[PDB]
Structure formats: C-alpha cells, structure tokens
Coordinates of C-alpha atoms and ligand atoms in Angstrom, one line a residue:
Chain A
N1 CA 0.0 0.0 0.0
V2 CA 2.8 2.4 -0.9
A3 CA 0.4 4.5 -3.0
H4 CA -1.6 5.5 0.1
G5 CA 1.2 7.6 1.4
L6 CA 2.1 9.0 -2.0
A7 CA -1.4 10.2 -2.6
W8 CA -1.6 11.8 0.8
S9 CA 1.8 13.5 0.2
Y10 CA 0.7 14.5 -3.3
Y11 CA -2.2 16.4 -1.6
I12 CA -0.6 17.8 1.5
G13 CA 2.6 18.9 -0.2
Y14 CA 1.2 20.1 -3.5
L15 CA -2.6 20.2 -4.2
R16 CA -3.4 21.7 -0.9
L17 CA -0.9 24.5 -1.6
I18 CA -1.3 25.4 -5.3
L19 CA -5.1 24.9 -5.8
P20 CA -6.2 27.8 -3.5
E21 CA -3.9 30.1 -5.6
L22 CA -4.6 28.5 -9.0
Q23 CA -7.6 30.6 -9.9
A24 CA -5.7 33.9 -9.2
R25 CA -2.7 32.7 -11.3
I26 CA -4.9 31.7 -14.3
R27 CA -6.7 35.1 -14.1
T28 CA -3.4 36.9 -14.1
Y29 CA -2.2 35.1 -17.2
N30 CA -5.5 35.6 -19.0
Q31 CA -5.6 39.4 -18.4
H32 CA -2.0 40.4 -18.2
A33 CA -8.2 31.8 -22.8
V34 CA -6.9 29.2 -20.3
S35 CA -9.5 27.1 -18.6
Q36 CA -10.0 27.3 -14.8
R37 CA -9.1 23.8 -13.7
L38 CA -5.8 21.9 -13.2
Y39 CA -6.0 18.7 -15.3
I40 CA -3.9 15.9 -13.9
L41 CA -3.1 13.0 -16.1
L42 CA -3.0 9.6 -14.2
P43 CA -1.8 6.8 -16.5
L44 CA -2.6 3.6 -14.7
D45 CA 0.4 2.0 -16.5
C46 CA 2.6 4.6 -14.7
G47 CA 4.2 5.4 -18.0
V48 CA 4.9 9.1 -17.3
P49 CA 7.1 11.0 -19.8
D50 CA 8.8 14.2 -18.9
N51 CA 8.0 15.9 -22.3
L52 CA 4.2 15.9 -22.5
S53 CA 4.3 17.5 -26.0
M54 CA 6.4 14.6 -27.2
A55 CA 3.8 12.1 -25.9
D56 CA 1.1 13.4 -28.2
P57 CA 1.4 15.5 -31.4
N58 CA -2.0 17.1 -30.6
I59 CA -0.8 18.3 -27.2
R60 CA 1.4 21.4 -27.6
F61 CA 3.1 23.4 -24.9
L62 CA 2.1 27.1 -24.9
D63 CA 3.4 29.0 -21.9
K64 CA 4.0 28.9 -18.1
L65 CA 1.7 30.2 -15.4
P66 CA 2.9 32.9 -13.0
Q67 CA 5.2 31.2 -10.5
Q68 CA 4.1 30.5 -6.9
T69 CA 6.8 30.8 -4.3
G70 CA 6.8 30.0 -0.6
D71 CA 9.2 29.2 2.3
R72 CA 9.0 25.4 2.7
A73 CA 10.9 23.4 5.3
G74 CA 13.9 25.8 5.4
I75 CA 14.0 26.4 1.6
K76 CA 13.3 30.0 0.9
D77 CA 11.1 30.7 -2.1
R78 CA 10.3 27.2 -3.2
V79 CA 9.0 27.5 -6.7
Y80 CA 5.7 25.8 -7.7
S81 CA 5.4 26.2 -11.5
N82 CA 2.8 24.9 -13.9
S83 CA 2.7 24.7 -17.7
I84 CA -0.2 25.7 -20.1
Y85 CA -0.9 23.3 -23.0
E86 CA -2.9 23.6 -26.2
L87 CA -4.9 20.6 -27.5
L88 CA -5.4 20.2 -31.2
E89 CA -8.1 18.4 -33.1
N90 CA -7.8 18.0 -36.9
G91 CA -5.3 20.8 -36.9
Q92 CA -7.7 23.1 -34.9
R93 CA -7.0 24.6 -31.5
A94 CA -9.7 22.8 -29.5
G95 CA -8.7 23.7 -25.9
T96 CA -6.2 25.4 -23.6
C97 CA -5.5 24.0 -20.2
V98 CA -3.1 23.7 -17.3
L99 CA -2.0 20.1 -17.9
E100 CA 0.5 17.9 -16.2
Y101 CA 1.1 14.3 -15.1
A102 CA 0.7 12.8 -11.6
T103 CA 4.3 12.8 -10.6
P104 CA 4.0 10.1 -7.8
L105 CA 3.0 7.7 -10.5
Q106 CA 6.4 8.2 -12.1
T107 CA 8.0 7.5 -8.6
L108 CA 5.8 4.4 -8.4
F109 CA 7.4 3.2 -11.7
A110 CA 11.0 3.8 -10.8
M111 CA 10.3 2.3 -7.3
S112 CA 9.4 -1.0 -9.0
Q113 CA 12.8 -1.2 -10.7
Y114 CA 14.9 -0.7 -7.5
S115 CA 15.5 -4.1 -5.9
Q116 CA 16.0 -2.5 -2.5
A117 CA 12.5 -0.9 -2.6
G118 CA 10.8 -4.3 -2.2
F119 CA 8.2 -3.4 -4.8
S120 CA 7.5 -5.9 -7.6
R121 CA 6.8 -4.7 -11.1
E122 CA 3.6 -6.7 -11.1
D123 CA 2.0 -4.5 -8.4
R124 CA 2.5 -1.3 -10.5
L125 CA -1.1 -1.3 -11.9
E126 CA -2.5 -2.3 -8.5
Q127 CA -0.9 0.7 -6.8
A128 CA -1.7 3.1 -9.6
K129 CA -5.4 2.3 -9.1
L130 CA -5.0 2.7 -5.3
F131 CA -3.3 6.0 -5.9
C132 CA -6.1 7.3 -8.0
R133 CA -8.7 5.9 -5.6
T134 CA -7.0 7.5 -2.6
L135 CA -6.6 10.8 -4.4
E136 CA -10.3 10.8 -5.5
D137 CA -11.4 10.3 -1.9
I138 CA -9.2 13.1 -0.7
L139 CA -10.3 15.7 -3.3
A140 CA -13.9 14.8 -3.0
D141 CA -13.7 15.9 0.7
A142 CA -11.0 18.5 0.3
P143 CA -12.1 22.2 0.7
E144 CA -9.2 23.4 -1.5
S145 CA -10.8 21.6 -4.5
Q146 CA -13.6 24.0 -5.4
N147 CA -14.1 23.1 -9.1
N148 CA -10.5 23.8 -9.9
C149 CA -9.0 20.3 -10.3
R150 CA -9.9 17.4 -12.6
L151 CA -8.4 13.9 -12.4
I152 CA -7.9 12.1 -15.8
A153 CA -7.3 8.5 -15.1
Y154 CA -7.0 6.1 -18.1
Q155 CA -5.7 2.7 -19.2
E156 CA -4.0 2.6 -22.6
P157 CA -4.4 -0.8 -24.4
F158 CA -5.8 5.6 -28.3
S159 CA -5.6 9.4 -28.3
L160 CA -4.5 11.2 -25.2
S161 CA -5.6 14.6 -26.6
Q162 CA -9.1 13.2 -27.1
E163 CA -9.3 12.0 -23.5
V164 CA -8.3 15.5 -22.2
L165 CA -10.8 17.2 -24.5
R166 CA -13.7 15.1 -23.3
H167 CA -13.1 16.3 -19.7
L168 CA -12.5 19.8 -21.1
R169 CA -15.9 20.0 -22.8
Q170 CA -17.7 18.9 -19.7
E171 CA -17.1 22.3 -18.2
Chain B
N1 CA 4.8 1.8 7.1
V2 CA 3.9 5.0 5.3
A3 CA 7.5 6.3 5.8
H4 CA 8.9 3.6 3.5
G5 CA 7.2 5.1 0.4
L6 CA 8.0 8.7 1.4
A7 CA 11.7 7.9 1.9
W8 CA 11.9 6.2 -1.5
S9 CA 10.0 9.1 -3.1
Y10 CA 12.3 11.6 -1.3
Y11 CA 15.2 9.9 -3.1
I12 CA 13.8 9.1 -6.5
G13 CA 12.1 12.5 -6.9
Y14 CA 14.7 14.7 -5.3
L15 CA 18.0 13.5 -4.0
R16 CA 18.7 11.4 -7.1
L17 CA 18.1 14.5 -9.2
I18 CA 19.8 17.3 -7.3
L19 CA 22.8 15.6 -5.7
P20 CA 24.6 14.8 -9.0
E21 CA 24.4 18.6 -9.8
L22 CA 25.0 19.9 -6.3
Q23 CA 28.8 20.1 -6.5
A24 CA 28.6 22.2 -9.7
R25 CA 26.1 24.6 -8.3
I26 CA 28.1 25.1 -5.1
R27 CA 31.3 25.7 -7.1
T28 CA 29.4 28.3 -9.3
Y29 CA 28.3 30.2 -6.2
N30 CA 31.7 30.1 -4.6
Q31 CA 33.5 31.4 -7.7
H32 CA 31.0 33.7 -9.4
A33 CA 33.0 29.6 1.3
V34 CA 30.0 27.2 1.2
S35 CA 30.7 23.6 2.1
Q36 CA 30.3 20.8 -0.4
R37 CA 27.5 18.7 1.2
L38 CA 23.8 19.1 1.4
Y39 CA 22.8 18.9 5.1
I40 CA 19.3 17.6 5.7
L41 CA 17.7 18.1 9.1
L42 CA 15.6 15.2 10.2
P43 CA 13.7 16.1 13.5
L44 CA 12.3 12.8 14.8
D45 CA 9.4 14.7 16.4
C46 CA 8.5 15.8 12.8
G47 CA 8.3 19.5 14.0
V48 CA 9.4 21.1 10.7
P49 CA 9.1 24.9 10.5
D50 CA 9.1 26.7 7.2
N51 CA 11.4 29.5 8.5
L52 CA 14.6 27.8 9.5
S53 CA 16.1 31.1 10.6
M54 CA 13.2 31.6 13.0
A55 CA 13.8 28.2 14.5
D56 CA 17.4 29.1 15.8
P57 CA 18.9 32.6 16.3
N58 CA 22.3 31.1 15.4
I59 CA 21.1 29.8 12.0
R60 CA 20.9 32.7 9.5
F61 CA 19.8 32.6 5.9
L62 CA 22.5 33.9 3.5
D63 CA 21.7 33.4 -0.1
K64 CA 20.3 30.9 -2.7
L65 CA 22.2 28.5 -4.8
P66 CA 21.9 28.7 -8.6
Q67 CA 18.5 27.1 -9.6
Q68 CA 18.3 23.7 -11.2
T69 CA 15.6 23.3 -13.8
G70 CA 14.2 20.3 -15.7
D71 CA 11.1 19.0 -17.5
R72 CA 9.3 16.8 -15.0
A73 CA 6.1 14.9 -15.8
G74 CA 4.8 17.5 -18.2
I75 CA 5.9 20.5 -16.2
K76 CA 8.5 22.5 -18.2
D77 CA 11.4 23.9 -16.2
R78 CA 10.5 22.5 -12.7
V79 CA 12.6 24.5 -10.3
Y80 CA 14.8 22.8 -7.7
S81 CA 16.1 25.6 -5.4
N82 CA 18.2 25.3 -2.3
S83 CA 19.2 27.9 0.4
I84 CA 22.6 28.6 1.9
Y85 CA 22.7 29.2 5.7
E86 CA 25.3 30.6 8.1
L87 CA 25.7 29.1 11.5
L88 CA 26.8 31.4 14.4
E89 CA 28.6 30.5 17.6
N90 CA 29.1 33.1 20.3
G91 CA 28.4 35.8 17.6
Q92 CA 31.1 34.3 15.3
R93 CA 30.5 32.9 11.8
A94 CA 31.3 29.2 12.4
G95 CA 30.1 27.6 9.2
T96 CA 28.3 28.0 5.9
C97 CA 26.2 25.2 4.5
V98 CA 23.3 24.3 2.2
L99 CA 20.8 23.5 4.9
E100 CA 17.1 22.4 4.8
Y101 CA 14.6 20.1 6.5
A102 CA 13.4 16.7 5.4
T103 CA 10.1 17.8 3.9
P104 CA 8.4 14.4 4.0
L105 CA 8.7 14.6 7.8
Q106 CA 6.4 17.6 7.6
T107 CA 4.0 15.6 5.4
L108 CA 4.2 12.9 8.0
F109 CA 3.1 15.4 10.7
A110 CA 0.1 16.8 8.8
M111 CA -0.9 13.3 7.8
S112 CA -1.4 12.4 11.4
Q113 CA -3.9 15.3 11.9
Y114 CA -6.1 14.2 9.0
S115 CA -8.7 11.7 10.2
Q116 CA -9.1 10.3 6.7
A117 CA -5.4 9.4 6.5
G118 CA -5.8 6.6 9.1
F119 CA -2.5 7.7 10.7
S120 CA -2.6 8.1 14.5
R121 CA -0.5 10.8 16.1
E122 CA 1.2 8.3 18.3
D123 CA 2.9 6.6 15.4
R124 CA 4.6 9.9 14.3
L125 CA 7.9 9.1 16.1
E126 CA 7.8 5.5 14.9
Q127 CA 7.5 6.5 11.2
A128 CA 10.0 9.3 11.6
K129 CA 12.6 6.8 12.7
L130 CA 11.6 4.4 9.9
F131 CA 12.0 7.3 7.4
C132 CA 15.5 8.1 8.6
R133 CA 16.4 4.4 8.7
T134 CA 15.0 3.8 5.1
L135 CA 16.8 6.9 3.8
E136 CA 20.1 5.9 5.4
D137 CA 19.9 2.5 3.7
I138 CA 19.2 4.1 0.3
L139 CA 22.0 6.7 0.5
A140 CA 24.5 4.2 1.8
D141 CA 24.0 2.2 -1.4
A142 CA 23.2 5.1 -3.8
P143 CA 25.8 6.1 -6.4
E144 CA 24.5 9.7 -6.5
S145 CA 25.6 10.2 -2.9
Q146 CA 29.4 10.7 -3.3
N147 CA 30.2 12.5 -0.1
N148 CA 27.8 15.3 -1.0
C149 CA 24.9 14.6 1.5
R150 CA 24.7 14.4 5.3
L151 CA 21.7 13.3 7.3
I152 CA 21.2 15.1 10.6
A153 CA 18.7 13.1 12.7
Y154 CA 18.1 14.3 16.3
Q155 CA 15.6 14.0 19.1
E156 CA 14.9 17.3 21.0
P157 CA 13.9 16.6 24.7
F158 CA 19.2 21.9 23.0
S159 CA 20.9 23.9 20.2
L160 CA 20.2 23.1 16.6
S161 CA 23.1 25.2 15.4
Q162 CA 25.5 23.1 17.6
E163 CA 24.2 19.9 16.1
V164 CA 24.7 21.1 12.5
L165 CA 28.2 22.4 13.4
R166 CA 29.3 19.0 14.8
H167 CA 28.6 17.3 11.5
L168 CA 30.2 20.3 9.7
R169 CA 33.5 20.0 11.6
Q170 CA 33.7 16.3 10.7
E171 CA 34.5 17.2 7.1
Ligands
PWB1 N1 12.1 21.3 -5.5 C1 12.1 20.5 -4.3 N2 12.4 21.1 -3.1 C2 12.5 20.4 -2.0 N3 12.1 19.2 -1.9 C3 11.7 18.5 -3.0 C4 11.7 19.1 -4.2 N4 11.3 18.2 -5.1 C5 11.1 17.1 -4.4 N5 11.4 17.2 -3.2 C6 11.2 16.2 -2.1 O1 10.9 15.0 -2.7 C7 9.5 14.7 -2.3 C8 8.8 14.0 -3.5 O2 8.7 14.8 -4.6 P1 8.0 14.3 -5.9 O3 8.2 15.1 -6.9 S1 8.5 12.4 -6.3 O4 6.5 14.3 -5.5 C9 5.8 15.5 -5.2 C10 5.1 15.9 -6.4 F1 4.4 14.9 -7.0 C11 4.0 16.9 -5.8 N6 4.7 18.1 -5.9 C12 5.2 18.8 -4.9 N7 5.7 20.0 -5.3 C13 5.6 20.0 -6.6 C14 6.0 20.9 -7.7 N8 6.7 22.2 -7.4 N9 5.7 20.6 -8.9 C15 5.1 19.4 -9.2 N10 4.7 18.6 -8.3 C16 5.0 18.8 -7.0 O5 3.9 16.5 -4.5 C17 4.8 15.4 -4.2 C18 5.2 15.5 -2.8 O6 6.0 16.7 -2.6 P2 6.6 16.9 -1.2 O7 7.2 18.3 -1.2 O8 5.7 16.7 -0.1 O9 7.8 15.9 -1.1 C19 8.9 16.0 -2.0 C20 10.1 16.7 -1.3 F2 10.2 16.3 -0.1

C-alpha cells in the first residue's frame, strides 16, 4: 500500500498548496483563454514521460503560469510552477488547459525497478489504481478543491488529446 | 509503514536528481565559502518549521544556490532551489552550509492530523525513525551520494546550530 502515502503526500505537499492560488494565477495570465481547472493525467500503467508534448502531437506546450513561491521546510522561495498546454483536433485549437502528469505515478514506476524498494513490477497497476482511488477520496472531501482540479485516469491498451478534451468539454 | 514510500520518493524524486548537480552549483556560487555537502535536518518529532532562521537565532539565511531546472512529468522547467545558511557560535560565523529540513517529515506530521489518512498521532515518532532508517539504507548504497549529502537526525527533549556544526566539523 505504498500508493496511500504517496497520494496523501501529493495532496498535503502540493494540491493543498497550489489549488487555493490556482484561480488567481490563471486570471493573471488571461488578463496580463486558459481554462480554470488543473487537469492531472493519471496513466494507470505509470508510463509518465517528462516531455508531454512529445507524448502526443495534438498536445502542444504554450506558456507557463505565473510562478508560486513560498518558504517550505527551510527552503526560501520554493517554486511551484505549472505549464499551459494547447490541445489540437484536426489541426484546430480545441482547448487550452493547465496540464501535467501525476508525478508520484512516475515515482511508483522507478520504485518497482529498484530491488531494495521491495516493490515488484507486477504491483504497478494495483498501486496506480490505489493512488487514483485514494486521491479521489481526498479531493472529494477537500475544501481546497472548489471546481479547480480534474483527475484524468485512463488505461492505454488511443488518443491522449481526445481524453483530455472530453473532460474539457464537460465544463 | 507510510514512511517507506515517502523515503523512496524523497530519493527518486529529489536526492537522485539534485545531488549529481549539487557540486557544480556550489562551485558556481563560490567562484561567481559554502561547504560541499547538502545537510538535511531530520527532526524525529517531525516538527518542521518553514522559516529555518526563525527556529534558531544562530542559524541565519545567507543566499540561494543557482537554480536547477528540468522538465518533470509534463511540467516544463521545474525549479529545484536550495538555500545557503550561516551558523553562528558566540556571535562568530562558524560555518556556511546548504541546509534544509526533510520535507516528508512535515507531510508525516500533517498526515497524522487528517482523520481520513488513518494515521494516528502516536505513530509519528515510529515513522520518523523508519523514514531516517530507510533513507540511510538508500543513500549508503546510492551512487549519486558521493560525499555530498549528510543526514542530521536528532531528538529534542538543546541547540540546533551546535548539532549542525558538529557534522560540519567532521569534514
Ligand atoms: N524542488 C524541491 N524542493 C524540495 N524538496 C523536494 C523538491 N522536489 C522534491 N522534493 C522532495 O521530494 C519529495 C517527493 O517529490 P516528488 O516530486 S516524487 O513528489 C511531489 C510531487 F508529486 C508533488 N509536488 C510537490 N511539489 C511539486 C512541484 N513544485 N511541482 C510538481 N509537483 C509537486 O507532491 C509530491 C510531494 O512533494 P513533497 O514536497 O511533499 O515531497 C517532496 C520533497 F520532499
């Protein structure tokens, strides 16, 4: 049950901190049109690339949001930065969103390759589902999540841009 | 055993990334004298303040290291920043180090206060020791730790500056 602690740390040390300030940062970039929610990609195979634009030709990096800084555990001005992506459909700009992967899923992957971690590669999908399940239960009861965060969990046997656009059109 | 996953994520998603580049960043600040190792404070009571200078009058913030950036899980130029601190002894500058707290210990604390986390406040010291024990076993076998990281675990029943200075004088 390693994913339980990673999901609670993903909320306490990130979502609880950036989500209350996400609406003000998006409004600052819009004025001085990006959508209002932070869209988190949760691949249940834990295949998390670092270049999201290289994972889908229809997902294109656009710009960065205004940075969020704060003193965190003795580190002065710890930077919390997020990227804005454009989603294409038949060569048409179909949406603009703050998009990123669920980083602890990447840690879950590399943890399975370290023999000292005691985490078999077979349990990767099991813990990925537990991570999404735990995070869903936290955000459903979290006051910081006020229609400003959307979890996008999927299982690739496929268009990643189409999956993001379906959640984008629900708003 | 929540601390097991937090310690492995503290290494995979941080120490493995910044320690290979820490020597070059310290040499850049020195030329264009800070010590060579990253000193991590691990309070076993998990009492981690955000203002380290406010936790000890003999620990004084000095400057920031050159920032380390990198594309991480769809986030372009994720910033990894570290702070340089000065340690005083009888009003004398006794040492200069890159000092910070073990952030997952702070997450371990807040996790004990959330009722949905299923983590009792009594198990805080137990998991703090497991976190330090797990991290010690990782760094002892990690190739990225080449005499560039020093764990400072302590139990306050006391001078935090004196504890850091004792490890500082060992080098
Ligand atoms: N720059 C820097 N400074 C100091 N310390 C660091 C550090 N980077 C890593 N660490 C240490 O390694 C742990 C695991 O990091 P990891 O990356 S695998 O997972 C994170 C991540 F998914 C999400 N998250 C938090 N901040 C985030 C930002 N800015 N962007 C995107 N996602 C973020 O929340 C998880 C828990 O973050 P945490 O702070 O509680 O624990 C961290 C921290 F203790």
